Design a protein around this ligand. Structure first.
Ligand code: FES
Lengths: 146, 99, 64, 116, 39, 148, 120, 172, 144, 112, 100, 63
């Protein structure tokens, strides 16, 4: 920030991160997110559809959002925050962790080569105008429809 | 139309002069007007705009004409015979016998 | 008797595969050469379980 | 050829094995279950003939009722498969690859993975 | 102007079912309103 | 100014709704609480039955014997001539004015509209196109030059 | 309930069917048929059928079939008791009455749920 | 939507599944619908020739998308290829390109859509539907061609060729 | 190796069947595609660098039966068959893609461990015939 | 040792009786090559005899090639039939050149 | 790039005589009918009895929850009760065709 | 009042020996237009019975 004395507050619009997403109805919808928020958090705030979000971000301690990822982290807890990122965004993201790959591999619905966990995705300034798609994630248990 | 409340008969006559012969459709108002307007369009070419159904009613399949018109002759133009070269019914020009 | 409305109605919801007609529609036709079709009607009737669902009467087969 | 008891036991065991051998279709499973129940009834009749026991022969009616209950439950379950959006061939409901299916192929229902 | 009395959309129907008949017939009886029906 | 007027109108409407709510008696409040409690335990079938009752559907087998008189025989209301006198009739879609240019390619090609408008303005009256019936050899002799 | 005599009778029935087939061949020997475009096509009151194998039904009698199977099982169970009713006892009468009451209760419950009618 | 072109009027791929255990879908753009077309609402009034042209192009594309199924179902693929049928239909449409009345264009489009649906429903005979899809000036590819006129009337002008044939019967 | 060209379907089939090549690269060409000359030059050039696969060149125009046997949907095509069994195909003309596919095919063929006696050459139609007998024949009998 | 570099498991099996050469990934996201796309487009263009395929510049206009909507939409429909893929209405109306059409076809993973 | 009041950056509008501009105005007007935000999100309004989370706006009534997604298919069905000018090729329709 | 209902003829004559126009309003056409509205919900046998009870003569409808 480095805000000085007497300076006026900054408009949140200057910190608005744009995500163009293909929703399960095949709809191009634009979501706005704040820096540092998880993709799952942004989707929940914007009420995006298609993401079951069974684990609601998984564990709260030593989460995958922390940088660097701790070796004692438990990784994702469900397979519902599946989002396919664009080629530039996925290239900038990098390679999925070992636990991320292990969890994404054991998914009932088919996955894509650019599939990443929304709860494991962190908002970076590089992700402005980021393109994502949200194929319909699976439903697991009897309480998933509750 | 017939009004049972007044027990009378009314006849609305609409004059059409546009070359397109397009008029509004009362099918969405009166239920019987669907088939009636379909037959009217199929026979005279009165285009019922915003009609419930524009499907053909009585005209022969694969035939595009308005026989109920002052221009159309009695015999028409197309007559169907049996094409042995096709082993089925084909359609050719109508060569009719005249009185 | 008891209420059986649900056992008689089946509406279709937007993009709801369950609410759609989840069966191959038997698009049988009461064509011209049928004993009960009166000879000059082709009543294309979408029938579901021997119960007519939709009607499209091809008429004009005897238009003279 | 083989003695009747040995033939019946071997047939029961082979039918139990073949119940898993064929592909995973619910209707085929129900038919195999009916065949197995009939084979069990036949085995019970043969045993009652061998030992001359009234209780052994009494099983056929109970076996028939149990088989009918199972068949009705299976028919009801198969009828429910239509609304569950699950194919009768259960192998098409799993994304795990298998060499038994000649034409299995599943892809994500999207147009372009990388947009520009 | 005074508020108009409520007019039901279920009302103004050519026929009344059991529920509509109960709704309209509140405060009275079937024989009290339409008379006794004989067989 | 339009935003302020809309806010004022929304405030007026909210005040009307609240006054409709705030002027309830003890019996009305108890009935509302009981309705909330019943809605907490009313199944989806119960909600569907409530909607059908609001729609005048039959509530018993005897009434269902002539159910078609209510659900089916009820003809739909005719549409409005204002709806008939419309401006555009294209399918509804999201305005891809600020969306990414890759997604902007999926919108309706308005450039074709302007080009066709220019073409039609330039071509108000056009002579009939005559497709010649003159006999000619086939362009693809394969139907007559195929050996196998 | 059948024997080798019945087997030989089935064989003789097959022989009679073969004789009928010979008669059919002899009758067909006096006819000549010319192949037509729709000669071997489906007869659908004068038009080409819009389906070949996709002929599926709604199957609205599934509950009826299941109840029929259950009732057949119950009737088969009741049959042995009535087959030798001459030696009926108090316990036998009680069991028969219980079975009859159970069948009646099942039928009433099936009717009580309106499950005996076709559904959309 | 509740229309013959609606998305929900698609035959399920499986007896219990629409498309697959992971997603739904069906084919109705290039094939027939699940149920019959109960109603065919009239086209919305287009006040602009641009809108009329857009509607005409949409109708042409829709007809082209079903040309394969139309040819395959009628066993008339031997008469001309799918591309050949498309070219013949394009020539036929170009024959009526002189139209300038939006109402007439809408009526013609509605009639053509109805005729195509009738063809899609196989209500019309194949030998009659071949009239629209036949080549304009070339022999049918399902039968041999004779160049007797091209050889005898070699380089002969149209007037001379017509004079040599005769416009009426020569006996009466 | 070198590209061996055959304009007779029977001659090409006999030549292919006699050699029993472990890896066969069939360059099927037709005059319809204007880019066939570049494909022919690429096939001739790449025939030398990779002797592991026998390069057989057939012109579909002069050998109509070749298109039916090879199920060539379009031309020019490069069909890579392993021991007579279809392994891969290249539908367009691309030297880099063809070379990468050839290298991948060679690596995959080397990596396999065929059981003794079951590593014999088979005709290209054997797989289609077996598939028809296993799946198509039963469906056809059940239907018509 | 739990080697994080080994993400392989039983669910990762990608062997099929259909493809002789094993597929790269379990997801069959195989896009068509530009060469195959060009060959199919060349065949489709050869279907309409009014254009010369030998000197085809893929970025040129369909009208310059000699195609109106009667030909351009017909060519697009033929390409769709060959590729068994349906272009969204915006894509069909906005396709300007053969190069753009080829790019759009290559981008689709559902193409076959 | 500099951004306007909204979160999207400033972009030059279409021409004055543009059919694109006319279509944008018509789309905004139709969005006002179903209570759709400028980004296409069902916004808030006055709560409506028996409509769940759906509220009532000023120029219309919404078809979904506050800040929801306005489905194009729902709007098309609601506006045109049964009118199908053409089998419009939408992304969902293309996806269904691809699934088939 | 024909047995099937009101059968009407609307004749407009321009003074010549032949009427300028002659439309026929057959009640059979009206009965045919309402059968689908009456046929909804009925089985196949009920549909056949209703077709019999609709009193529709195909010649009157076809004209
Ligand atoms: S919340 Fe479970 S996958 Fe992210």
């Amino acid at each position: 920030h480095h805000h000085h004395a007497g300076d006026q507050a900054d408009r949140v619009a200057d910190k608005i991160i744009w995500i163009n997403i293909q929703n399960r109805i095949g709809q191009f919808e634009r979501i706005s997110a704040f820096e540092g928020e998880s993709l799952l958090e942004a989707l929940q705030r914007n009420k995006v559809a298609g993401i079951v979000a069974t684990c609601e971000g998984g564990e709260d301690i030593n989460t995958m959002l922390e940088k660097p990822i701790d070796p004692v982290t438990y990784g994702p807890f469900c397979s519902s925050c599946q989002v396919v990122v664009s080629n530039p965004w996925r290239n900038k993201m990098g390679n999925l962790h070992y636990l991320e790959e292990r969890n994404l591999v054991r998914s009932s619905y088919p996955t894509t080569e650019n599939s990443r966990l929304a709860c494991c995705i962190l908002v970076e300034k590089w992700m402005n105008e980021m393109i994502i798609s949200i194929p319909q994630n699976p439903n697991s248990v009897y309480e998933d429809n509750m | 139309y017939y009004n049972y409340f007044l027990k009378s008969k009314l006849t609305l006559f609409i004059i059409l002069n546009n070359l397109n012969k397009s008029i509004d459709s009362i099918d969405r108002i009166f239920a019987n007007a669907n088939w009636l307007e379909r037959e009217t369009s199929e026979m005279y070419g009165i285009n019922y705009k915003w009609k419930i159904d524009t499907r053909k009613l009585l005209l022969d399949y694969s035939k595009i004409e308005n026989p109920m018109l002052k221009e159309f002759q009695s015999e028409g133009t197309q007559d169907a015979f049996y094409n042995i070269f096709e082993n089925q019914v084909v359609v050719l020009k109508n060569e009719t016998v005249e009185l | 008797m008891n209420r059986s409305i649900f056992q008689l109605w089946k509406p279709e919801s937007p993009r709801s595969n369950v609410n759609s007609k989840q069966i191959k529609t038997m698009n049988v036709n009461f064509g011209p050469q049928h004993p009960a079709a009166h000879g000059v009607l082709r009543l294309i009737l979408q029938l579901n379980g021997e119960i007519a669902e939709r009607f499209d009467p091809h008429i004009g087969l005897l238009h003279r | 050829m083989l003695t009747w008891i040995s033939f019946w036991s071997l047939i029961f065991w082979l039918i139990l094995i073949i119940l898993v051998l064929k592909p995973k279709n619910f209707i085929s499973i129900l038919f195999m279950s009916e065949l197995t129940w009939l084979a069990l009834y036949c085995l019970s009749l043969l045993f009652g003939a061998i030992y001359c026991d009234i209780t052994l022969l009494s099983i056929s009616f109970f076996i028939l009722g149990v088989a009918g209950l199972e068949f009705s439950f299976g028919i009801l379950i198969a009828i429910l498969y239509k609304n569950l959006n699950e194919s009768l061939n259960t192998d098409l409901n799993n994304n795990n690859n298998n060499q038994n299916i000649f034409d299995k192929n599943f892809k994500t229902p999207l147009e372009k993975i990388n947009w520009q | 102007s005074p508020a108009p009395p409520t007019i039901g959309q279920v009302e103004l129907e050519p026929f009344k079912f059991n529920h509509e008949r109960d709704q309209l017939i509140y405060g009275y009886t079937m024989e009290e309103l339409y008379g006794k029906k004989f067989g | 100014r339009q935003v302020l007027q809309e806010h004022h109108q929304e405030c007026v409407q909210l005040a009307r709704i609240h006054a409709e709510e705030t002027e309830k008696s003890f019996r009305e409040v108890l009935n509302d609480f009981d309705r909330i409690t019943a809605e907490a335990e009313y199944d989806h079938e119960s909600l569907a039955l409530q909607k059908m009752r609001d729609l005048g559907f039959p509530m018993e087998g005897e009434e269902e014997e002539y159910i078609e008189q209510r659900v089916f025989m009820r003809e739909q209301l005719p549409p409005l001539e204002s709806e008939f006198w419309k401006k555009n009739y294209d399918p509804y879609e999201q305005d891809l004015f600020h969306f990414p240019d890759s997604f902007k390619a999926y919108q309706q090609q308005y450039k074709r509209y302007d080009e066709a408008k220019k073409y039609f303005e330039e071509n108000p009256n056009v002579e009939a196109t005559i497709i010649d019936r003159e006999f000619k050899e086939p362009t693809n002799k394969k139907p007559w030059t195929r050996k196998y | 309930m059948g024997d080798a005599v019945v087997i030989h009778l089935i064989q003789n029935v097959l022989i009679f069917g073969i004789i009928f087939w010979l008669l059919t061949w002899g009758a067909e020997y006096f006819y000549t048929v010319k192949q037509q475009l729709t000669k071997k096509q489906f007869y659908e009151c004068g038009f080409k059928s819009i389906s070949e194998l996709n002929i599926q039904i709604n199957f609205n009698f599934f509950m009826l079939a299941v109840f029929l199977i259950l009732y057949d099982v119950e009737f088969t169970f009741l049959f042995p008791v009535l087959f030798n009713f001459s030696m009926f006892s108090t316990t036998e009468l009680f069991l028969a009455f219980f079975f009859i009451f159970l069948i009646l209760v099942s039928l009433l419950y099936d009717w009580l749920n309106n499950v005996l009618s076709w559904s959309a | 939507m509740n229309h013959y072109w609606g998305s929900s009027n698609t035959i399920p791929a499986s007896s219990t599944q629409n498309n697959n255990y992971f997603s739904g879908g069906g084919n109705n753009v290039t094939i027939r619908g699940n149920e019959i077309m109960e109603r065919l609402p009239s086209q919305t009034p287009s006040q602009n020739m641009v809108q009329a042209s857009m509607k005409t192009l949409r109708f042409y594309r829709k007809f082209c998308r079903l040309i394969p199924f139309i040819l395959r179902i009628h066993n008339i693929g031997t008469k001309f290829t799918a591309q050949q049928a498309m070219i013949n239909f394009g020539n036929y449409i170009r024959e009526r390109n002189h139209y300038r009345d939006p109402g007439l264009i809408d009526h013609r489009i509605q009639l053509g859509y109805e005729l195509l649906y009738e063809a899609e429903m196989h209500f019309s005979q194949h030998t009659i539907l071949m009239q629209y899809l036949s080549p304009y000036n070339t022999p049918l590819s399902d039968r041999g061609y004779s160049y007797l006129e091209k050889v005898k009337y070699g380089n002969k002008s149209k007037f001379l060729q017509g004079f040599y044939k005769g416009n009426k019967p020569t006996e009466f | 190796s070198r590209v061996r060209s055959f304009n007779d379907f029977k001659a090409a089939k006999t030549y292919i069947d006699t050699l029993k090549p472990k890896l066969a690269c069939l360059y099927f060409r037709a005059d319809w595609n204007p880019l066939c000359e570049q494909a022919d030059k690429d096939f001739d050039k790449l025939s030398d660098t990779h002797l592991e696969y026998e390069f057989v060149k057939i012109d579909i125009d002069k050998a109509p039966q070749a298109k039916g046997y090879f199920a060539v949907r379009c031309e020019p095509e490069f069909l890579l068959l392993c021991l007579g069994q279809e392994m891969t195909r290249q539908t367009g003309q691309n030297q880099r893609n063809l070379e990468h596919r050839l290298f991948k095919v060679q690596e995959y063929v080397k990596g396999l461990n065929f059981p003794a006696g079951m590593d014999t050459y088979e005709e290209f139609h054997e797989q289609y015939m077996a598939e028809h007998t296993q799946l198509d024949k039963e469906i056809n009998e059940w239907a018509r | 040792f739990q080697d994080n570099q080994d993400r392989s498991r039983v669910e990762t099996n990608s062997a099929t009786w259909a493809h002789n050469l094993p597929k790269e990934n379990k997801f069959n996201t195989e896009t068509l090559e530009k060469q195959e796309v060009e060959s199919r487009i060349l065949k489709v263009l050869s279907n309409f005899e009014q254009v010369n395929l030998k000197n085809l510049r893929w970025e040129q206009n369909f009208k310059k090639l000699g195609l109106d909507s009667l030909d351009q939409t017909a060519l697009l429909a033929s390409i769709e039939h060959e590729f068994t893929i349906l272009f969204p209405d915006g894509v069909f109306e906005g396709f300007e050149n053969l190069e753009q059409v080829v790019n759009y076809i290559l981008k689709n993973i559902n193409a076959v | 790039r500099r951004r306007s009041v909204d979160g999207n950056a400033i972009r030059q509008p279409h021409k004055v005589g543009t059919y694109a501009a006319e279509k944008q105005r018509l789309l905004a007007e139709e969005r006002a009918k179903f209570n759709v935000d400028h980004l296409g999100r069902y916004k808030g309004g006055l709560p409506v009895k028996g409509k769940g989370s759906i509220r009532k706006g000023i120029h219309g009534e919404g078809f979904g929850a506050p800040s929801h997604a306005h489905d194009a298919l729902i709007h098309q069905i609601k506006q045109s009760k049964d009118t199908m000018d053409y089998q419009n090729i939408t992304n969902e329709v293309a996806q269904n065709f691809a699934n088939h | 009042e024909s047995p099937k209902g009101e059968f009407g003829v609307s004749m407009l004559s321009d003074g010549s020996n032949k009427p300028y126009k002659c439309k026929v309003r057959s009640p059979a056409l009206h009965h045919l237009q309402v059968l689908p509205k009456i046929g909804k919900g009925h089985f196949l046998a009920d549909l056949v019975a209703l077709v019999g009870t609709v009193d529709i003569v195909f010649g009157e409808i076809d004209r």
